[PDB]
Amino acid sequence: VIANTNLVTALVMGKAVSNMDDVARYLLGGGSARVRADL
Amino acid sequence: VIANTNLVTALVMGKAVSNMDDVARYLLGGGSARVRADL
Fold first, then answer.
1. Number of CB atoms found within 10 A of residue A35's CB
2. CB B5 within 8 Å of CB B20
3. How many A-B residue pairs are in contact by the CB < 8 A criterion?
4. Which residues of A touch B20 (CB under 8 A)?
5. Mind telling me how many Å the CA of A4 is from chain B's nearest CA?
6. How far is CA A19 from CA A2, A24, A35, B8, B27, in A?
7. How many other C-beta atoms can be found within 10 angstroms of the C-beta atom of residue A20?
8. Which residues of B1-39 are buried (b: 16+ CB within 10 A; e: fewer)?
9. Quick check: B20 and B13 in contact, CB under 8 A?
10. A28, A27, A24, A8: which is closest to A16 by C-alpha?
11. Using CA atoms, how far apart are residues A24 and B10, in angstroms rounded to an integer?
């Protein structure tokens, strides 16, 4: 989902990246279930 | 200057806008001297 950092870019400029938040933080300082099958 | 929001944008995206801080803060809630002259 795109929100709160990719939103502003996707609106004012027109492109977005997935891990924009991790990129920002690094750049500027600051269940399972069982099923029948065959193996 | 470009810093802390245009920095990441210009480094990963390739574009940068002037008043990025204000539009960001908007989308998500978040002395003179005397000289002589001829008037």
1. 5
2. yes
3. 33
4. 8, 12
5. 7
6. 10, 9, 33, 12, 20
7. 21
8. eeeebbbbbeeebeeebeebeeebeeeeeeeeeeeeeee
9. no
10. A8
11. 12
- Residue corresponding to tokens 């210009």: B10
Q: Please tell me the experimental approach by which this structure was elucidated.
A: cryo-EM
CB A21 within 8 A of CB A8: no
Decide if B17 contacts A13 (C-beta within 8 A).
yes
Q: Quick one: resolution in A?
A: 4.5
Identity of the residue in A7, A12, A23 whose CB atom sits nearest the CB atom of B12 = A23
